[PDB]
Design an enzyme around this catalytic site. Structure first.
Site, PDB file in Angstrom:
ATOM      1  N   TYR A 164       4.516  35.660  33.371  1.00  0.00           N
ATOM      2  CA  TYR A 164       3.851  37.140  33.491  1.00  0.00           C
ATOM      3  C   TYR A 164       5.577  38.474  33.085  1.00  0.00           C
ATOM      4  CZ  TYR A 164       4.793  41.193  36.052  1.00  0.00           C
ATOM      5  OH  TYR A 164       4.714  42.787  36.514  1.00  0.00           O
ATOM      6  N   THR A 201       1.927  47.563  46.823  1.00  0.00           N
ATOM      7  CA  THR A 201       0.933  47.572  46.285  1.00  0.00           C
ATOM      8  C   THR A 201       0.682  46.092  46.905  1.00  0.00           C
ATOM      9  OG1 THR A 201       0.868  45.496  44.653  1.00  0.00           O
ATOM     10  CG2 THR A 201       0.659  47.890  44.421  1.00  0.00           C
TER      11      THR A 201
END
Ligand SMILES: NC(=O)C1=CN([C@@H]2O[C@H](COP(=O)(O)OP(=O)(O)OC[C@H]3O[C@@H](n4cnc5c(N)ncnc54)[C@H](OP(=O)(O)O)[C@@H]3O)[C@@H](O)[C@H]2O)C=CC1
Ligand SMILES: NC(=O)C1=CN([C@@H]2O[C@H](COP(=O)(O)OP(=O)(O)OC[C@H]3O[C@@H](n4cnc5c(N)ncnc54)[C@H](OP(=O)(O)O)[C@@H]3O)[C@@H](O)[C@H]2O)C=CC1
Ligand SMILES: NC(=O)C1=CN([C@@H]2O[C@H](COP(=O)(O)OP(=O)(O)OC[C@H]3O[C@@H](n4cnc5c(N)ncnc54)[C@H](OP(=O)(O)O)[C@@H]3O)[C@@H](O)[C@H]2O)C=CC1
Ligand SMILES: NC(=O)C1=CN([C@@H]2O[C@H](COP(=O)(O)OP(=O)(O)OC[C@H]3O[C@@H](n4cnc5c(N)ncnc54)[C@H](OP(=O)(O)O)[C@@H]3O)[C@@H](O)[C@H]2O)C=CC1
Ligand SMILES: CC(C)(C)N1CCN(c2ccc(N3CCN(C(=O)N[C@@H]4[C@@H]5C[C@@H]6C[C@H]4C[C@@](C(N)=O)(C6)C5)c4ccccc43)nc2)CC1
Ligand SMILES: CC(C)(C)N1CCN(c2ccc(N3CCN(C(=O)N[C@@H]4[C@@H]5C[C@@H]6C[C@H]4C[C@@](C(N)=O)(C6)C5)c4ccccc43)nc2)CC1
Ligand SMILES: CC(C)(C)N1CCN(c2ccc(N3CCN(C(=O)N[C@@H]4[C@@H]5C[C@@H]6C[C@H]4C[C@@](C(N)=O)(C6)C5)c4ccccc43)nc2)CC1
Ligand SMILES: CC(C)(C)N1CCN(c2ccc(N3CCN(C(=O)N[C@@H]4[C@@H]5C[C@@H]6C[C@H]4C[C@@](C(N)=O)(C6)C5)c4ccccc43)nc2)CC1
Lengths: 264, 261, 260, 264
Positions: A164, A201
């Site tokens: 990532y 989130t």
């Protein structure tokens, strides 16, 4: 690029033609909602047509000039290129490209998962380049903006998110270099790199649960700050709970190294 | 401790992209130090000449294995072969790159993907393949990067993306190795312009700046790797080395580290 | 401190009541002239009575709303206090206090010169505090500005100017601390600290000759940049020849430490 | 050039040390540590009676010798005469610990020019006078000057304007002379100690009713100052929080001091 020496006002997005990727959830969905409230034309994308339909429903109710969704995978470079051309036909042009989607990622020590490293690079980085190439002719026509959603993990190293982090570092290197190319070749398309800290989130809260204990900043404000920075043609946007992060993250030594080479 | 060439005596070392430029100079320094060397690049003809010169310089052993790092199977099999030949591995020097020119980005996605596959992905594949042997020797991974891997420059966007990706990946796994007690060091080398024949051909005369000597660059990479330094800086100017350091990044990394369970 | 979020326009200084210390020569003189051209009211000070007279006359010629001088030494704290009262009486108030004077100094290794240390502290620092104290009631009435002229030697260590460096560092410590106080006690007087690199003034060029070799920024542009920052109510102004200094001299760690 | 070794209390054995402001707080603790290390100690402050009690405790702790000379550091003649007498008492000087400060309260600055002048005189000018008087003996021993400063001498805090001005002045003066000594090969080290809040009786009374932060222990503080001094470190950082230490460092200033040096 040259930022707009102006205060942000919601009227700036009224009637603007905006693409939001990875807008079925989290930050992307919140960006689509803020844009809808501003009366913008919005085209949203992600893989799940069912969640994308729900996002468009709320966008139309919030007051978007128009709102559409096109479902598909950003693993597929043909879909990526075709999505932009379709999004542009639906709105009759393009003012802002918000690249925000990422491949599914969990917090884990790296061992031998080369396929996750490759997929992160294709989805989180390569597809962004393909979308930019597809969008650039329309963006040049409107003197538009490219908004790239990155992370603090794209500026500093973090354990457990190697693939990532690699993909987010790649966004900085590519988009920052092309920003310099646009400056020299007088291409009036702004590039905004958004360096985000941990955001509340659904995906983030599930992923860090029991692994990482730190403040998560609100997704609604985060989304707005991304839209403002892009609208103001800022080079970089920083958004985090601590600040602290805010003022330590800027790199003047990098700026001098880049300026001193803008003479050779 | 200070560096001593004897630290490399009898050490089992892989050098990628070693048929020319910095890689070749690294194979020569290793050869003079009496290391066991396995070199790779696509060209057997140039590798043959690097190997014969390494033996003349006093390498304990020198062999080549030819292949393309666009091929992940080759990358994996190369490490197994080189390690089985030397009977282990102490140091993995990742230096190869795909052919690059200074050009404004122009819809050439194929070049962006190739740069990502060769300059970045193959390094991950080689590291995965080498890790069990490096864990056995408490070895070292040396990752050759660039100033264009820390700051933005026009005309090398694909190359810059791949070099930046190296920092994110290798700096992240270094934090992981530290907490999981993996005794394998990771050295990222940040290089300014070097007088390799490839660099001189690609930059003259679009750009005007001093190129640093490839022989001294190669030695500094080896010293840093041998000394297990996190980052090696090498440029014509000492002022550049002072500006590469990012102390704020190091504070942020330590701060964020304490959030992990 | 809330800086004015507008671009600088010379009209900002039209009819403004401005004191300029150390205005007989160098940067101080250049500041008086800029303010004159902008049509401000000017009260200039320094010891050289004849030079100040020449500065005042040239100020009226450039278009100053008014120009006056009060001669004296900032070694004399009674003078400093009375100078402000008298300057404020001449102009009918005060909008900007520009503290620029320094005692005569050269580049020398420090050995046992306590006299030069005390004199630098009294003139370059203590007098600035006495002038500020005397100016404050007027500045509070006008929502005015204090502009403190400092140096790179007031932010980083330099050999050969130990006494001078101590006084300039003291300015940062004093004025940045009172700036924090004005924000909490809601005192709408702005504080601008000006961090300058080597400037091509006659005193500087003579002092650094054969000792220090480096680019010197122009005094006319320096003077303007000081006035701009003051007018814009900026916390700090950085002015140097090398665009290495400008963006390296900022201290985000200090900003975090202060955020309490 | 600091000492590339670990600190050992034996480094202070038989060393000839001055500690100012040693009747109480950090100063008293420094005198006690030095006594435990078997150093020769000359302590000063105004409190004749408590200095005698400090001295008797130093002897009990194992000091090689311990003496006091009482006086005010507002008096520059006393400051000058104190060093000469301290030197005779010990037969030289290896370390000068400058620690005294004038009485300071947390108060908003209004028109207290007297307090600004007194702070400057006592906290700064007397340090310079003490240094000048000590230098011939310090040059003879390749000695060390230890300057006790504060976080208020590195950053701005309200309510301590006069004090902060005096602490910033110590940085400008002593750091400039440190550059001079290194280039003129004067083998006298200069250590600047940057302290966070410390649990001394004076500090605890002064902060009561104002700020509410954790004060670090005075005894560990005192030792840390002595260690940095003995190790010839340029700066010593001591605070309740390790995070403060990371923030005190100024690498940009260190870079700038290097480029500015090349021009000499
Ligand atoms: N949340 C946080 O803490 C932080 C977030 N960020 C960045 O912000 C952005 C959004 O974060 P967040 O909202 O948490 O992410 P989410 O995981 O909530 O959503 C990611 C989005 O991408 C879509 N997506 C996933 N896989 C693909 C694919 N193959 N093709 C196309 N779209 C895909 C998802 O929809 P679907 O699965 O239906 O395709 C979804 O809409 C990212 O760029 C992230 O790196 C940066 C720092 C911290
Ligand atoms: N020279 C400079 O100015 C700078 C160099 N660097 C870095 O230093 C390293 C070396 O630079 P330099 O010596 O100039 O490079 P060169 O171009 O001189 O050589 C690159 C090497 O990689 C090999 N290579 C090329 N393509 C492939 C492939 N597909 N598979 C396997 N090997 C391949 C080449 O051999 P063959 O073609 O036969 O395969 C050659 O041995 C790189 O990592 C570069 O980014 C960083 C900053 C500046
Ligand atoms: N020039 C440079 O390179 C740099 C300058 N600076 C700063 O800029 C400011 C001005 O610099 P610069 O113009 O070079 O200096 P100058 O020496 O050119 O002028 C100083 C002024 O102060 C006056 N002055 C001197 N002594 C006294 C005194 N006892 N009482 C009252 N006034 C006095 C002088 O006038 P008179 O003799 O008639 O009294 C003169 O008008 C200072 O604060 C300096 O520290 C900062 C960094 C670098
Ligand atoms: N405590 C804290 O939180 C912090 C302390 N510091 C620094 O540490 C040092 C010591 O602080 P601390 O121990 O708290 O202070 P204390 O007030 O406890 O003691 C100060 C010492 O100075 C002496 N002193 C006072 N006035 C004079 C004078 N006119 N002449 C000579 N000596 C004098 C006092 O003794 P006597 O009255 O007998 O003269 C006393 O021994 C100072 O430099 C301070 O700035 C820095 C940061 C925080
Ligand atoms: C001083 C205090 C107040 C105590 N601070 C503590 C430290 N700090 C900070 C530090 C780090 C972070 N992030 C940001 C980078 N990063 C990240 O982008 N993760 C993302 C996030 C979660 C998960 C991995 C990755 C993709 C996710 C997805 N949607 O698939 C799934 C969404 C990250 C990774 C792992 C842990 C933390 C983080 N955010 C804030 C500022 C606040
Ligand atoms: C502050 C002062 C002192 C004034 N300095 C100014 C000058 N400076 C500087 C700037 C840039 C550079 N490089 C290094 C990065 N980079 C690079 O990696 N290029 C490489 C190099 C050339 C070409 C592209 C790429 C792969 C190459 C190959 N073998 O295929 C072919 C080899 C690069 C790119 C283009 C131009 C220059 C460079 N070196 C030094 C440092 C700072
Ligand atoms: C390599 C390049 C790129 C050329 N750079 C070099 C580094 N740099 C830089 C560094 C340092 C400086 N100053 C500023 C601080 N300082 C100072 O304030 N001096 C002042 C000045 C001279 C003298 C002492 C003092 C009072 C003076 C007066 N009026 O009485 C008399 C006026 C100072 C002291 C001694 C030497 C230099 C300086 N200015 C610029 C930027 C450019
Ligand atoms: C970022 C994080 C990690 C969250 N931290 C935030 C908080 N922090 C901090 C801030 C400030 C402080 N001090 C140190 C400076 N200072 C000081 O020198 N005071 C002294 C002290 C008290 C009084 C004034 C002065 C002289 C005194 C005497 N003996 O006469 C009387 C003794 C001070 C003043 C008032 C309050 C606090 C302090 N210490 C720690 C560390 C960093």
């Amino acid at each position: 690029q040259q930022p707009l020496n102006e205060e942000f006002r919601p009227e700036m997005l009224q009637g603007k033609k905006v693409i939001v990727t990875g807008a079925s959830k989290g930050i992307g969905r919140e960006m689509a909602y803020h844009l809808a409230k501003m009366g913008a034309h919005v085209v949203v994308t992600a893989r799940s047509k069912e969640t994308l339909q729900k996002v468009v429903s709320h966008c139309l109710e919030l007051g978007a000039a128009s709102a559409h969704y096109i479902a598909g995978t950003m693993e597929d470079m043909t879909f990526a290129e075709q999505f932009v051309a379709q999004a542009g036909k639906l709105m009759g042009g393009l003012d802002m490209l918000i690249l925000n989607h990422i491949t599914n990622t969990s917090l884990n020590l790296f061992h031998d998962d080369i396929h996750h490293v490759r997929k992160s690079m294709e989805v989180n980085f390569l597809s962004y380049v393909v979308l930019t190439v597809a969008a650039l002719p329309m963006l040049k026509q409107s003197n538009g903006s490219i908004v790239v959603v990155s992370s603090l993990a794209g500026k500093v190293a973090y354990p457990m998110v190697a693939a990532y982090s690699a993909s987010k570092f790649a966004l900085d290197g590519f988009f920052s270099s092309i920003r310099k190319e646009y400056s020299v070749s007088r291409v009036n398309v702004s590039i905004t790199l958004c360096v985000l800290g941990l955001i509340d989130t659904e995906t983030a809260m599930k992923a860090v649960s029991g692994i990482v204990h730190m403040q998560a900043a609100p997704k609604e404000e985060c989304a707005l700050e991304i839209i403002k920075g892009g609208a103001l043609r800022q080079e970089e946007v920083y958004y985090d709970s601590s600040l602290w992060t805010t003022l330590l993250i800027r790199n003047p030594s990098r700026k001098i190294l880049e300026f001193l080479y803008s003479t050779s």
